[PDB]
């Protein structure tokens, strides 16, 4: 028993982390087969970062100007190009630790694990969510760019995030593994701000289902609501509007517990307007929004990875 936010085991990703250095700029890269992926802003030293013309700035760079380091070993770069906001280095050695993998672009609300790295050295791992405002509330210091987010399915690593920057509010922005940013953000040290964020309603509902699955069910009531009536209430508390698509995603959790989604929405509505009144839910005093419906199934089902 118990219910914890868990990261995926990070071994398969650890085996891919390398160090990429241009001049005095050192950040992390992702080594898969004979390609190293990293943030293109690695090529910038000093204040180049204000308004870089990456395309031209890159044209000057040579292969020997990239110092790629994997453990105690320097990897020989034999090619380089740009793909959107990512640099792609071709090295002369295919990574023997390459796991089965996939590049995916995730949707706002979806969760993933982040392996925080510095100088190519994995340092910590944590679970987080892509916020509705397209940022993540991570924990990153200087030199963490190139750190990746990922999920694991059976034996396949789905890479879904590479870290590029910290916004003025202390939250974080980055790209998919095709180099395309999540959100309207661009990779320059200009002024950019995150939009107002909302609570991930779909995930809260999943978590309430989690609670019920674990015998924590005091908040359930004998009423229901229409979707529209739920949204009218929830949006006042800064919750994402709930859609019929979301309702369908909660199907399996609804079937398992025998609780219709709108009946649960009625529970959630009552919880928002009245608070908990001292009680807790899965040991939390707060309504949790970083577990997806699928996270809940995976955990309550002891899913493992090969």
């Amino acid at each position: 028993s118990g219910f914890r936010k868990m990261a995926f085991p990070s071994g398969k990703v650890e085996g891919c982390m390398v160090q990429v250095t241009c001049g005095t700029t050192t950040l992390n890269g992702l080594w898969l087969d004979d390609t190293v992926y990293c943030p293109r802003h690695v090529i910038c030293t000093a204040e180049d970062m204000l308004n870089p013309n990456y395309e031209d700035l890159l044209i000057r760079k040579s292969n020997h100007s990239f110092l790629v380091q994997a453990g105690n070993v320097q990897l020989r770069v034999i090619g380089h190009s740009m793909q959107n906001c990512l640099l792609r280095l071709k090295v002369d050695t295919s990574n023997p630790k390459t796991p089965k993998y996939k590049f995916v672009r995730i949707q706002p609300g979806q969760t993933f694990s982040v392996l925080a790295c510095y100088n190519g050295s994995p340092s910590g791992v944590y679970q987080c969510a892509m916020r509705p405002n397209h940022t993540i509330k991570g924990s990153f210091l200087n030199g963490s760019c190139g750190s990746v987010g990922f999920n694991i399915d059976y034996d396949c690593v789905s890479f879904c995030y590479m870290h590029h920057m910290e916004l003025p509010t202390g939250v974080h922005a980055g790209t998919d593994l095709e180099g395309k940013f999540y959100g309207p953000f661009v990779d320059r040290q200009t002024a950019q701000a995150a939009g107002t964020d909302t609570t991930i309603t779909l995930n809260v509902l999943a978590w309430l289902y989690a609670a019920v699955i674990n015998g924590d069910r005091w908040f359930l009531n004998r009423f229901t609501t229409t979707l529209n009536d739920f949204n009218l209430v929830a949006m006042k508390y800064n919750y994402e509007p709930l859609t019929q698509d979301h309702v369908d995603i909660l199907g399996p959790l609804s079937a398992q517990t025998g609780i219709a989604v709108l009946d649960m929405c009625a529970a959630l509505k009552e919880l928002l307007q009245n608070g908990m009144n001292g009680r807790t839910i899965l040991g939390s005093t707060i309504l949790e929004d970083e577990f997806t419906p699928f996270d809940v199934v995976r955990q309550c089902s002891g899913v493992t990875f090969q």
Binding site: H164, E166, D187, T190
Partner: peptide, 4 residues
């Protein structure tokens, strides 16, 4: 923003 800061390029980290």
């Amino acid at each position: 923003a800061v390029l980290x």
